[PDB]
Amino acid sequence: DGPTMREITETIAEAKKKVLDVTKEAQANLLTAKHGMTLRESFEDNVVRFLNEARD
Amino acid sequence: TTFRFCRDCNNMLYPREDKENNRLLFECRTCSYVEEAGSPLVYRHELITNIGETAGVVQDIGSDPTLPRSDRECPKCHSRENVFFQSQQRRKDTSMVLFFVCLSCSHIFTSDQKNKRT
Amino acid sequence: EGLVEYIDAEEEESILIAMQPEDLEPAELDVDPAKRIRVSHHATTFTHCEIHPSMILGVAASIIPFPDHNQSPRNTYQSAMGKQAMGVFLTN
Amino acid sequence: SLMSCISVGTDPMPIITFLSEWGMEPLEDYVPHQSPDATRVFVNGVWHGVHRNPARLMETLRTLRRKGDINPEVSMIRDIREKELKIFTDAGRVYRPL
Amino acid sequence: LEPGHAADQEQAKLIRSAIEHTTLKSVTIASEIYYDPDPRSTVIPEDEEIIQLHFSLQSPWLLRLELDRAAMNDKDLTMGQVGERIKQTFKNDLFVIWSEDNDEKLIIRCRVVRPKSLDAETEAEEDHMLKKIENTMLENITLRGVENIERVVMMK
Amino acid sequence: DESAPITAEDSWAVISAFFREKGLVSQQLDSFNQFVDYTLQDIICEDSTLILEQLRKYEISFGKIYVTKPMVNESDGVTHALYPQEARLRNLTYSSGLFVDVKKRTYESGKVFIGRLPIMLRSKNCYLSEATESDLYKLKECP
Amino acid sequence: KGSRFISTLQVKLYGREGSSARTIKATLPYIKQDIPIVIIFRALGIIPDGEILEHICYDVNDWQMLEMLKPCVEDGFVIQDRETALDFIGRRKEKRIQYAKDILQKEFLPHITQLEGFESRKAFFLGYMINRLLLCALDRKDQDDRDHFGKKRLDLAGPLLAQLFKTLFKKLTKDIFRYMQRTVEELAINAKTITSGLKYALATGNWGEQKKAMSSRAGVSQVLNRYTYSS
Amino acid sequence: LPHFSKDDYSPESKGFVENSYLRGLTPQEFFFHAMGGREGLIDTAVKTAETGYIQR
Amino acid sequence: HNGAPHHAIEEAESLLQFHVATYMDNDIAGQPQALQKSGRPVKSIRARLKGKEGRI
RNA sequence: AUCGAGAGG
DNA sequence: CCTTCTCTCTGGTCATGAGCCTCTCGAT
DNA sequence: TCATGACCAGAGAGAAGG
Ligand SMILES: [Zn+2]
Ligand SMILES: [Zn+2]
Predict the structure, then answer these.
(1) What are phi and psi of F26, to 5 degrees?
(2) Which one of B5, B24, B84, H38 has the fewest CB atoms closer than 10 angstroms to its CB?
(3) What is the tally of structural domains in chain D?
(4) CB count, 10 Å around CB of C92?
(5) Full residue range of the structural domain in which residue D23 is found
(6) How far apart are CA G209 and CA G225, in angstroms?
(7) Helix/strand/coil (H/E/C) assignment for every residue in chain I
């Protein structure tokens, strides 16, 4: 129903905003290079995790 | 580093030591040319490089429609007409920092905040 | 008359294609919740526009109804099976 | 795909002649340190020289192709940040209208 | 971890640093070669303090390495450890000094010394030999860690 | 009104015009027409000339090529036009003939037959490229 | 056009990733052992090292690529003129120089030209290939993608028929010439050759002349599927 | 895709389908989904022969 | 018994051994594959019983 | 019989 | 030092293989 | 087609001599 689709699309929009925030944070070299992986790897993992969270 | 050649043969010069005066000379092995060194640096080897990250910046950059236009202003001329791209360097451990080029004054600036060089 | 142009794979690496001519309309809500979600173009330096995105399909897949609502392996399977359906192959 | 067509093959000689008559400096007269910001020019994967101010050349070539004075199935690619201009009249390249 | 020594990420990090392989190449930024014949004074205005703090108690070719702060801090490494490792490598066949952890730049200055004729005069080896020495320093210098363990992660 | 921008519906018009001029197998037909009109002659004029030296010199060279319309030679019969339906029924090969202009020069000849080339249907040498829908029906070919 | 035979030029960076001796050698068609690039350049009439590097590094303020090229010049230092470069050749005196001269215009970059007196174009193109190689080795440009469609060509009916017809016409010509040799004291054109070869290829789908392996391309010609119109 | 500007690490640019099968996929989403499903088809094609050799 | 030269016997042996080999095994390192009529490789006793379609 | 192509689960 | 031998890991070419079963047609 | 053990001469470590 309408309410549920509204909540779904708002969830997807908030996930998109989360990914945008992480991307801009990475663009300013403000990423913590945690041990054992590059910055790009951390960024990719964060974005993939966010999108899977949103889908589920 | 720089590189110099013999004026007569146009072949590369090799370092030699003027032992008695402790001088640095660049000699040729084609002819008997020898010149005075203008820099003590003889060999540089970068393992981490910032060269080529802004490669391929030509004045016609504004006519590449595949490149994205941002909304930032130029620190020099304050023109919001600018393009940007990520580091052209293709090493796997490369910062995801944006380089902007102004379409009004050809000035290259950066989204980086942890440092600001060149 | 310079209205349509042939583009190969190497050339389109230097262009920015639009999906619909509506992407050339100026932007300035009450959207149908049933319509699919189309993101804004967020690109303006267009050089070409697709004739119709449905032209990315072949002969077989062009028979499928609503292939945009199907898991893609099912579309592959249907493209494989349509070549085995019975019918009038030629009038003569 | 439906609108997918395939290149048939064209003669490159008129293209090269038109190049050499519109500022495409030949390769033996290419002074790299005296013309550093020069765009290389390829015709079917063969380097035929360099060219300066290639935006005008690219506009002229696209105007000719969109007119018919060049075979529409010829591909003309200006890579800017690489300073290259590659022209293919090869046979067997897959294209589509736009 | 050692039985009972679990639930202590301090010793966990210590073991991780002790086991993860670390080469000299992983911390170097650039490796330069200069002709710097005067030991008491360098042509480089930056290394002055380095030789100024060197007054306690060869070859004019200088091999100068710059190190990355991020690579030194992601690990637990001080310039003294790197210097002691490079000195342990060649066993007095070259002179080595370095900067301190407080300076804006992390530098290591090395010179060659031949025992036969460099103890009485300043004879210079072929600069082609310092290239091979730099190759051995960047490829065959084991700072710490173990042979093939090129990465270590702490998990709970 | 004349210069107003198009909509997504009008695109279909263009698509229609695309096929009314190309059909669906334009690739095959264009490749084969290019092969017959141009490539064949180039292959013929490539190192064609032959030289034999005795004490004189005899030279044999090939000139322009000619590609007939598809015909067929019946044994105990004569050459006559071959249409596709007859080829598919009689297990024939819808091939036309090749004739080269050969000339013999000496030191200090008419058209010659070299073989038959199979013809792609609806190419510039196929009888159906110029055929009307009614002509197709009379030739027992599906439009 | 003509004999579309393939010559595979390989410019190999023999230096390992972290090792020294970053030499750059080249593979020549009829030459056993790889050849350093500077010897090939001086064989092409480009003697000075500065001119060689100008043919490779198209910018003066690019010292990384030039420093990469130093071992090549130190490798080719032993040869300093053109005839000495041509003398470095793999065979079983003066004939080796001519063999090298012939290879450098017949088998070396034949797509450029096979006419003698065009060494500048080939030298510049070799420098271009070396520049691309070093742009890759310096992690400045990414490895060339192989599955990019623009690098792919679709041989359609035209090219396949041409590949077959060139062979068939060559066989016909050889038969005609052998007949002329056989007719030294006295129209003998077996048209069955061309027709039969074309029909065999178009029927069996084996694109060749009664061969199995040399005509490894099988299934080129297939029975038209007439089950349904869309099929 | 040539319909995106260069260096676009956006969710939709790199294969996130925010629509449902019920709602319908966009052309870019369609192509990315087909690209993903082809990988599964190829894995199903190859793992069969590999597992056949293993079982034998 | 004809009194042949010393190196025509070389040819006789290079043919006899080759034929006996190809009759035993036709696919070997020697580039000659002993093609039969119509360019077909001669089926050897080895390949006769070797393989999934083989005898065993 | 061989060789090959296409197709099904 | 330097040979000289006596076994030595070290470097390289080579053989070998690649899912069952089933259907149809086509050319020699 | 192509990766990968399984091999199998040649350069190559020591010990022993010289
Ligand atoms: Zn000189
Ligand atoms: Zn500005």
Answers:
(1) -55, -30
(2) H38
(3) 1
(4) 10
(5) 9-90
(6) 25
(7) CCCCCCCHHHHHHHHHHHHHHHHHCCCCCCCCCCECHHHCECCCHHHHHCCCCCCC
Q: Does G227 touch chain D (CB under 8 A)?
A: no
* Distance between CA atoms of residues B23 and E103, nearest Å: 31
User: Residue D15 and residue F136: Cα distance in Å, rounded?
Assistant: 42
Distance CA A47, CA B96 (A): 14
Domains, chain E, ordered by start: 11-144 (3.30.1360.140)
B59: helix, coil or strand?
helix
Strands B23-27 and B14-18: antiparallel
B28 is known to lie in a ligand binding site: yes
- What is the secondary structure of B6-53 as a DSSP string? -TTT--B-EEEEETTTTEEEEE-SSSS-EEE-S-SEEEEEESS--SST
**Cross-strand pairs, E89:** none
Do residues A4 and A46 touch, judged by C-beta distance below 8 A?
Answer: no
Contact: G149, C9; criterion CB under 8 Å? yes
**DSSP state letters, F1-58:** -TTPPP-TTHHHHHHHHHHHHH-S-HHHHHHHHHIIIIIHHHHHTSS--EEEE---EE
C65 at interface of A, judged by CB pairs closer than 8 A: no
Q: How many CB atoms lie within 10 A of CB E45?
A: 7
Tokens representing F67? 């590609």
Q: What phi-psi label fits residue G228: left (phi over 0), alpha (psi between -120 and 50 degrees) or beta?
A: beta
What is the arrangement of strands in the sheet containing E94-98, beginning at the earlier edge strand?
A: B41-46, E28-35, E61-67, E106-112, E94-98
Q: Which CATH number does B1-45 carry?
A: 2.20.25.10
Under 8 Å between Cβ of C43 and H16: no
> After which residues does chain F show a gap where C to N exceeds 2.5 Å?
55, 108
Q: G92 exposed, middle or buried (CB, 10 Å; 0-12, 13-18, 19+)?
A: exposed
Task: Give the C-alpha separation, E73 to E79, whole Å.
Answer: 11
Q: Which residues contact E146 (CB under 8 A, 6 or more apart)?
A: E19, E21
The residue ranges of every structural domain in chain B are 1-45, 46-118
C-facing residues of G in 67-126 (CB < 8 A) are: none
The helix or strand, by DSSP H or E, that contains position D97, with its residue range, turns out to be strand D94-97
Read off the tokens for F87: 């080829």
Q: Report the structure determination method.
A: X-ray
Other Cβ atoms closer than 10 A to F117:
22
Q: Which of B16, B42, B117 should one mutate to test binding to chain E, selecting the residue with the greatest count of E CBs within 10 A?
A: B42
Q: How many CB atoms lie within 10 A of CB F120?
A: 21
Find, in chain B, the residue whose alpha carbon is nearest to that of G71. Answer: B12
Can you point out the beta strands (E) in E24-155? 28-35, 61-67, 94-98, 106-112, 142-144
Q: Does residue G204 lie within 7 Å of nucleic acid chain K, judged by its CB?
A: yes
Please name the residues in contact with G80: beta carbons below 8 A apart, sequence gap of 6 or more: B30, G42, G47
Decide if E95 contacts E110 (C-beta within 8 A). Answer: yes
Q: How many CB pairs under 8 A join B and E?
A: 48
Distance (Å) from CA G206 to C1' J4?
Answer: 8
For H27, half-sphere exposure in the C-beta direction (CA atoms, 13 angstrom radius) is 16
Beta strands in G74-153 (DSSP E): none
Contact yes or no for E151 and A36 at CB 8 A: yes
User: What is the second-level CATH architecture of the domain B46-118?
Assistant: Single Sheet (2.20)
Q: Hey, are the CB atoms on D9 and F22 less than 8 Å from each other?
A: no
CA F80, distance to chain mean position in Å, is: 17
Q: Are strands G11-13 and F111-118 parallel, antiparallel or unpaired?
A: unpaired
Handedness of CA D44, D49, D51, D57 (dihedral sign): negative
